[PDB]
Amino acid sequence: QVQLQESGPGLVKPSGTLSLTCAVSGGSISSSNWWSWVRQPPGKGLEWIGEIYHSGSTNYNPSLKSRVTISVDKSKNQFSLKLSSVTAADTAVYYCARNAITIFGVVIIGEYYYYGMDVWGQGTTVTV
Amino acid sequence: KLRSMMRGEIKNCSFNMTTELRDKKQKVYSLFYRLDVVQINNK
Amino acid sequence: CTRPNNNTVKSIRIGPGQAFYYFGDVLGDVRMAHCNISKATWNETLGKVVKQL
Amino acid sequence: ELTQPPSVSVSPGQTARITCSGDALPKQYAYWYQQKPGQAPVLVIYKDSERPSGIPERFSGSSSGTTVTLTISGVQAEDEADYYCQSADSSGTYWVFGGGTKLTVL
Ligand SMILES: *[C@@H]1O[C@H](CO)[C@@H](O[C@@H]2O[C@H](CO)[C@@H](O[C@@H]3O[C@H](CO[C@H]4O[C@H](CO)[C@@H](O)[C@H](O)[C@@H]4O)[C@@H](O)[C@H](O[C@H]4O[C@H](CO)[C@@H](O)[C@H](O)[C@@H]4O[C@H]4O[C@H](CO)[C@@H](O)[C@H](O)[C@@H]4O[C@H]4O[C@H](CO)[C@@H](O)[C@H](O)[C@@H]4O)[C@@H]3O)[C@H](O)[C@H]2NC(C)=O)[C@H](O)[C@H]1NC(C)=O
Ligand SMILES: *[C@@H]1O[C@H](CO)[C@@H](O[C@@H]2O[C@H](CO)[C@@H](O)[C@H](O)[C@H]2NC(C)=O)[C@H](O)[C@H]1NC(C)=O
Ligand SMILES: *[C@@H]1O[C@H](CO)[C@@H](O[C@@H]2O[C@H](CO)[C@@H](O)[C@H](O)[C@H]2NC(C)=O)[C@H](O)[C@H]1NC(C)=O
Ligand SMILES: *[C@@H]1O[C@H](CO)[C@@H](O)[C@H](O)[C@H]1NC(C)=O
Ligand SMILES: *[C@@H]1O[C@H](CO)[C@@H](O)[C@H](O)[C@H]1NC(C)=O
Ligand SMILES: *[C@@H]1O[C@H](CO)[C@@H](O)[C@H](O)[C@H]1NC(C)=O
């Protein structure tokens, strides 16, 4: 299937930028879905972060609109999860994510259903 | 719950419509468009 | 051009003979009404216009 | 952005009712997940009332204004996992998550 492999740094020096990349195995990111990132602090619940479409349309947490930017490497079917100088307050397990949707009618007017977020990543224990 | 261009477009509505009798009214559910109704200020 | 909605019309007598029809219900789910046009034909059509202008 | 009861415990054979609260909920759908421990959390309910295929009919869902309801009818002991509700902005721009829900059967 479409398999999500996660990639990025390891042990992190505090207050540094963290660019991360989801190696999409079975990578067929044509224009079909939304792709995104979430995170889990190690004893807490989940945190939504951002969201991208294949064309380049991005969404972000307003709580993290500043320090978070994302992109996509469609040449390698890879993602970009970039950060600003984020402190050790966000030592969280990181998840590559797939917002699958369902095309209802005309896609140009945005007439579709958000299907549930389908296939998860692996788990990136980022230690800052 | 709709994301498309048709969001907030068709409006379910409610009446007290006079029936064929003089002293009988009737609650009626119907549908209308944005370009037919005007707010007054379930408003 | 199309209005792609499967609809339902109801009827209510409101007077002694006055019975009107109203937009009762939509089967399926709600779809925008739109119109199509061949773009390359229309640019070729509009290219003829500006020459006349 | 979203309110969620942190822990609800039951006994077996019951019917669990888990809610979330939010102002965008009269205008947005809400999606339900299931973090089993050490697992990728599985989609449970989409479009506020629909489960996908491969999902038992014990799971139900309904909405009420600014409140939603995750419904598990005939609760089994193996269904003890986390349960997260997800919605998005009132403007429909960015997604948000519920806080958390911890089940405890028996
Ligand atoms: C003017 O021009 C424009 C473009 O320039 C034209 O716009 C096009 O309009 C098309 C329809 O008018 C639209 O087509 C859609 O395509 C979707 C994708 O279909 C393709 O993939 C599937 C699967 O790979 C193939 O089976 C299919 O053959 C295609 O290759 C379809 O899915 C859409 O169909 C849905 O709507 C119709 C009508 O309502 C349903 O009969 C159909 O079954 C689909 O409905 C299901 O899905 C919706 C999605 O939410 C559900 O709400 C619905 O209840 C159905 O869901 C059931 O079934 C699914 C799947 O079985 C299941 O998962 C679910 O649980 C339910 O059981 C639709 O056909 C084009 O995309 C569009 N073009 C563009 C670019 O947008 C326009 O027509 C032109 N107008 C004129 C007058 O010429
Ligand atoms: C318009 O809104 C009214 C709100 O009362 C809807 O009426 C109720 O609809 C539910 C389910 O659709 C029924 O279970 C209730 O019995 C209805 N109430 C009454 C008094 O009949 C109505 O359905 C809406 N219109 C449409 C077309 O859905
Ligand atoms: C408008 O719609 C009609 C049918 O919905 C289109 O007619 C078809 O056109 C294609 C190519 O022009 C032909 O191969 C088909 O045989 C036609 N079918 C029928 C039933 O006529 C028409 O082309 C559409 N017009 C535009 C501009 O898209
Ligand atoms: C209809 O009449 C009843 C009682 O007369 C009233 O409570 C209700 O608000 C009215 N509704 C409308 C839409 O006029
Ligand atoms: C509309 O719904 C009715 C329900 O009986 C069905 O018979 C009819 O074929 C539908 N028409 C379209 C265009 O979907
Ligand atoms: C239309 O055609 C003219 C020449 O035929 C070209 O210069 C112009 O860019 C075209 N416009 C579009 C929108 O394709």
- Integer angstrom CA distances of residue A46 from A42, A115, B33, D96, D98: 10, 19, 40, 10, 8
Nearest Cα to A104, choosing from C30, C42, B41, D97? C30
Q: Are C20 and B27 in contact (CB under 8 A)?
A: no
Domain count, chain D: 1
Ligand 1 pocket residue status of C6, Cβ below 6 Å: no
Q: Which residues form ligand 6's pocket by a CB distance below 6 Å? A: C 43, 47
Q: Are A122 and A40 in contact (CB under 8 A)?
A: no
Nearest Cα to D85, choosing from D22, D24, D12, D31? D31
Method: cryo-EM
Domain count, chain A: 1
Strand partners, A25: A3
CB contact under 8 A, D27 and B3: no
The C-alpha atoms of residue D106 and residue D100 are separated, in whole angstroms, by 20
Start-to-end CA distance of chain A, whole Å, equals 33
Nearest Cα to A128, choosing from A12, A3, A35? A12
Distance from CA of A110 to the nearest CA of B (A): 5
Nearest Cα to C34, choosing from C2, C11, C10? C2
The C-alpha atoms of residue A46 and residue D101 are separated, in whole angstroms, by 11
- Which residues contact residue B9 at a Cβ distance below 8 angstroms, ignoring those fewer than 6 apart? B33, B34, C30
DSSP code of A64?
T
The C-alpha atoms of residue D41 and residue D36 are separated, in whole angstroms, by 6
HEC string for chain C? CECCCEEEEEEEECCCCCEEEEEEEEECCCCCCECCCCHHHHHHHHHHHHHHC
DSSP code of B33?
E
The C-alpha atoms of residue A94 and residue A84 are separated, in whole angstroms, by 16
Pocket perturbation via mutation, ligand 6, pick of C41, C43, C50 by most ligand atoms within 8 A of CB:
C43
The C-alpha atoms of residue A53 and residue A34 are separated, in whole angstroms, by 5
Task: Give the CA angle between residues A22, D30, A49 to the nearest 5°.
Answer: 30
Q: Are D83 and D33 in contact (CB under 8 A)?
A: yes
**Domain containing A120: what range?**
1-128
Q: Are A51 and A99 in contact (CB under 8 A)?
A: yes
The C-alpha atoms of residue C2 and residue B30 are separated, in whole angstroms, by 23
Pocket perturbation via mutation, ligand 2, pick of B12, B14, B42 by most ligand atoms within 8 A of CB:
B12
Chain B residues with CB under 8 Å of a chain C CB are 2, 4-6, 9-10, 17-20, 26, 28, 30-32
3-state secondary structure of A89: helix
Q: Report residue D53: phi and psi, to 5°.
A: -70, 160
Which tokens is D94 given?
A: 């960015």
Task: Give the CA angle between residues A82, A88, A91 to the nearest 5°.
Answer: 70
**Domain containing D66: what range?**
1-106
> Tokens 């969404």 label which residue?
A59
Which tokens is D104 given?
A: 């405890």
Burial class (CB in 10 A: 0-12, 13-18, 19+), D95: buried
Distance from CA of D15 to the nearest CA of A (A): 24
The C-alpha atoms of residue B34 and residue D90 are separated, in whole angstroms, by 20
The C-alpha atoms of residue D66 and residue A85 are separated, in whole angstroms, by 37
Strand partners, A70: A81
Distance from CA of B6 to the nearest CA of C (A): 6
